[model samples]
Target: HMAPGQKECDNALRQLETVRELLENPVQPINDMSYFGCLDSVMENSKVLGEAMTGISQNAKNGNLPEFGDAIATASKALCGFTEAAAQAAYLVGVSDPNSQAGQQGLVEPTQFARANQAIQMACQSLGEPGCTQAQVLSAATIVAKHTSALCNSCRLASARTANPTAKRQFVQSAKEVANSTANLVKTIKALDGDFTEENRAQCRAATAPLLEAVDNLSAFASNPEFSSVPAQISPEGRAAMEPIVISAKTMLESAGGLIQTARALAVNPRDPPRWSVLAGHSRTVSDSIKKLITSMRDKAPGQLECETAIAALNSCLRDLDQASLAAVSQQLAPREGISQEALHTQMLTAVQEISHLIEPLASAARAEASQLGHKVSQMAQYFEPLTLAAVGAASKTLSHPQQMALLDQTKTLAESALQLLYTAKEAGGNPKQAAHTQEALEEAVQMMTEAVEDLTTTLNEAAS
Candidate 1:
């Protein structure tokens, strides 16, 4: 019944002699699923996503998840809405000027989402041509969509792995990631325009709301769990397995919060990025460690976020205080007297005063931040309070040393006065809880400086006699 030309799809195999170009090597078979995962990772690495992640983390931990969740969720949905945004952006650049190079050859490469965003802006500006509107939107949407899809998938996976304990570290991580993706998608949309209007910003926040509710439910589980049958512990292996998930959740949360906070700051004044950067950098590592600890405790069902956050914050303060102390160690060893003994005294006094000043702000900031985080996390503040005292103690000991060297008697006295100034500052910060305690510490420091001056006088008197 088949015709001669329709002989079992004969036209499909018909040869063409016009083809002149061929690939020099065989094309590798693409693993679409695996490639998708790789692509998702790259897209998530985009700066917009990173910024979103940072904001979401900070907002959630401060118990503002309820406030910001809806916007994030809306942003996520927008990702699917704007598909192909990337391709349009790519074509826009490729066709604009064949000679134009993308990114900086002699300059720093911008963040990933930023580059995608740049392409999106270019695509949108050029979109009056046929089919350009849809192309631009789709290209922008695709990048966001991919990020959201990956984030959602990861969350589902975490839920599958965990017992759904409220505040379960793995679950928290999954939840925050989904929130972050939503934020990122909103960012992609906003980048199409110059600045976000208040209404649009509210929509972006709405997208994350449901996820925040989910986390709140999870935290409720953490606070008050319905008793289920207990299983026997599997020793160290089981403990080790849960650690990473717990750690990652805490880190992502804090980092996400940092991003949101930075964005708000930028809204006010973009030039002052360093403040947010400092906060973000300082909190990043400890937040990660906290997540690990949380994960470890999840299996045991005894983890506490506040305690963990506090410990981490305190440790960070200590580390910073340690660095300052080390840097000032040279000052402590500075010659007590020399041909320029007067100058030497002046320098030591200044060094100690400066060192004390440096530590005061750190202590103040750490205490204030810990207190502001609220009662749930307030207990850890005390842990960090001792560091200021420790710094003062180090300075006190340095000032109290009785080493004598060649110097005019008058110069030594002035050096002693310099030590007294630093000693006074140290005393001022003492007994942060009790004025009396601070007063006592200050007195102790003053006494030490006094002894230093007396020792110099004693030595000088002996030399004169």
Candidate 2:
């Protein structure tokens, strides 16, 4: 029922060889879940290829006329090549594209703009916190100046590299405004440097708005396509498959307030009233956006592609990550200045001693004294209350309510999970049917502990930064 295969077979073989070669040295995946999902698709493709090839064998055995035999054979090779292409894609996305321009220097990173804005915001806000030191004010102004120049440099770089004259011109003007406003803010801070009064603080605060506006304007300027880190080339089908992801990532980056307004929301001004919770709102907005796209998808690519299975698995991994991160973010409230610093360091050391004190008995109970393990674990969990608090408080002179809450949350889970882990270990020794339960609890405990440590270090680093 088909024509014979010729150059199609040759092309298929050629591509098959090409795919194999690329597979030899594949890009490692950052998008690991999807990477495996791709291999999962490749696995199915091979199965389909095997069935397709068998049809060719059957046609040949039937001694069908060359016309019918050729058709099956050509179709078989076509599918083989197609399957090979699927493998090539697996190798490519088993990780990020090698040629992707993400994080490149000349291309202004949108995230860096967030970083810069945060720097100024923190500096400005700190000047208002209780007992504002003279040097602290100086430090704040210095950082504001530093970030101003850094951002100005970005505006100029991106503008010059910009191909569009209009975008380029807008960016230049934007950069000039940033320089002008920040210069005045810096000058105002200088006049206020020694004053340290309500009036002086008022001056600095007033200048702050104009500087923030300029930076925001330049931030918008950076939104011009010319300034962005470019995306790698993706096949139309692949691109369509990731349409929702693209929309969500771009949406998260934009702060309708300024193009990714997380900075403002994160600043924690009660009066500013976050437009909505980033965590909850982002989920709803992104889910709605995804639904919108898929609803339209009801019409196009109606083949209801097999990649859906992979997508399902990908979402499963994403959901898993969400919970794990939430656990980490919740692990906060674990640092301080001279009297405060001395007090925090002392409390931190004291907590550690007590925490370590319980661990030995807990370990002893888990390994040897099952009867005592119960009390040991209860004692250990009790001390973890102060353990995480001291851990965080000692690490930073200051913390955002969010960071503190995150540390507390992670450490809380860490304590609960750790206790459960010991309980499971003791249970396993007495041991489900019990080994898997123990292992599962153990995994969660280990993950919580690891994430807690990460947050503690990260919180401190942010404070130091």
Candidate 3:
């Protein structure tokens, strides 16, 4: 038997109105000042809970509310359970401490805590009350349990992003607290003298399962490795293979940098249509370049796996830039307060950070490749010095030792090997300037080796005397 009078619907409407009001305000540091005084009367109780639950179910049809949905669901359900249990003469289990340090660190808004406890007070009344039907009480409890599950899941999601280990631990603990409270609430709701069925309990359990899984995930989280330390070391074969990717990756990063610059400028003066158009053009060009580079690398150089990571990251970076640009344009035309320009700028900055993270590997690999040429050139120069010494010994007619012959052979082998390395390195698609420098060094090495061999022949003849 549903509660008599229009009180339930009216309460729901009142709470619904408050929900909208709550949306209007910033949801942080949720102190008394952040409170929404929507729960003033018993008339605002059971009916308000049902109405709010129905309202949320309808609102969800619009789109995914990544940040706000879980909070709204949890608060509404808790409120509904409060009203139902109160009307049926049963009491809901109370929420844990509102000001628990862990709750704050978990990002549990104070308003959320208040609504949940208020709901529990409504539901946990005299168990045998005649005004509320078993159906009404059970329905409200189920809805409240679902909301609690969502709220816990949201807390764990936030914990995953929290960098500070202590803060993250607090967040996970807060989730656990909510889970335990909700479990207690569910048990009390089941024990209450209402027409509760297995189906109702099943629905409640279904919701609880996901929340438990989410908490488990949060507890298992470890700090992921930052992209900053990707190794720059590359084999000679790898260096040659990545040459095309490195060249194209640098171009893509340059274009991405330009797009970020343009987006930031537009974020400041968004009304400037011409500037907006310029950013749009810049982002489109970069997107196209990235697509082409990715296709080319995938088709022709499938072996360059890091190149793919680099390209995919740049592609995502540009995609985020385009999203921010589109958001700006949308805001410019309609001028909605919801489309925050500052938020768009912050998101764009994050995309730019990702680009930097991805590009570091490509840049480091190129540096390693360039360094290789210098090392080989030095080896070539060092090997040439022994030949020069052998020549001096020959000219003085004092090169009678057998070890002098061995020195001549060893220098020849080392010089040839160094020259071969430089040739292989040059053939790889390294920096053209560095490649040319290596080419010059290889030529100089060949000339020195040739002169050393010629001089060694003369020294050998003289040593035989």
Top candidate on lDDT is 2
The Cα local distance difference test for each model comes to: 0.36, 0.49, 0.39
Overall local distance difference test of candidate 3: 0.39
Angstrom error at residue 82, model 2: 36
Q: Model 3 over residues 36-90: C-alpha lDDT tens digits?
A: 1111222244344335433432333333233223423443454433322221110
Q: What is the C-alpha RMSD of each candidate to the true structure, in Å?
A: 27.3, 28.2, 27.9
Model 3 TM-score, 2 decimals: 0.21
Q: Which one is best on TM-score? A: 2
**Overall local distance difference test of candidate 2:** 0.49
Every model's TM-score: 0.19, 0.28, 0.21
Please write out the lDDT profile of model 2 over residues 317-338, one tens digit for every residue.
3343345445445653222334
Off by over 4 Å in 1: 1-339, 356-363, 370-402, 405-465
Cα lDDT for residue 74, candidate 3? 41
TM-score ranking of the models: 2, 3, 1
